[PDB]
Amino acid sequence: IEELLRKILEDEARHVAELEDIEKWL
Amino acid sequence: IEELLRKILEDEARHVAELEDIEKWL
Amino acid sequence: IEELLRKILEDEARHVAELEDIEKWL
Amino acid sequence: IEELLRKILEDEARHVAELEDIEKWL
Ligand SMILES: [Zn+2]
Ligand SMILES: [Zn+2]
Ligand SMILES: [Zn+2]
Ligand SMILES: [Zn+2]
Ligand SMILES: [Zn+2]
Ligand SMILES: [Zn+2]
Ligand SMILES: [Zn+2]
Ligand SMILES: [Zn+2]
């Protein structure tokens, strides 16, 4: 469970950064 | 932008799958 | 923990649908 | 599209916060 939660956390954080990039590009 | 959005949304769908498995394990 | 996981699951699923909308609109 | 993306990314940031709390509770 620990490893899976860490991976979701990582990916969610990356999404914030990617979506902020998209917002700026749009 | 379209390709990046698709990668993000596919990962969001994987999060549903992973969270559902965490629910089962808990 | 159960209630919080359910809410994240719900929201992730909604994001798939919203992001697929954005993909179509773009 | 920009407003919707902002709502999504703000929720992604909340998921990091919520997942981190779940880690602590577990
Ligand atoms: Zn995400
Ligand atoms: Zn991702
Ligand atoms: Zn992921
Ligand atoms: Zn499953
Ligand atoms: Zn999401
Ligand atoms: Zn949301
Ligand atoms: Zn949420
Ligand atoms: Zn916290």
Containing structural domain, residue C2: 1-26
**What residue type is assigned to position D20 of the chain?**
E
| Nearest Cα residue to B9 out of C5, C20, A7 | C20
What does the block give as tokens for A10? 């990582």
Q: Which 3 state secondary structure label does DSSP give D26?
A: coil
What are chain C's partners, defined as 3 or more CB pairs within 8 angstroms?
B, D
Closest Cβ opposite residue B5 in set C6, C9, C23: C23
Resolution, Å (one decimal): 1.6
- Please tell me the total count of domains within chain D: 1
Residue of A nearest to D19 (CA): A9
C11: which chain B residues are within 8 Å (Cβ-Cβ)? Answer: none
Experimentally determined by: X-ray
- In chain A, what is the straight-line distance between the N-terminal and C-terminal CA atoms, in Å? 37
The alpha carbon of residue A26 and the mean position of all alpha carbons in its chain are separated, in whole angstroms, by 19
Tell me if B11 sits within 8 A of A15, measured CB to CB: yes
The alpha carbon of residue B14 and the mean position of all alpha carbons in its chain are separated, in whole angstroms, by 2
**B24 conformational bin, left if phi > 0, alpha if psi -120 to 50, beta if neither:** alpha
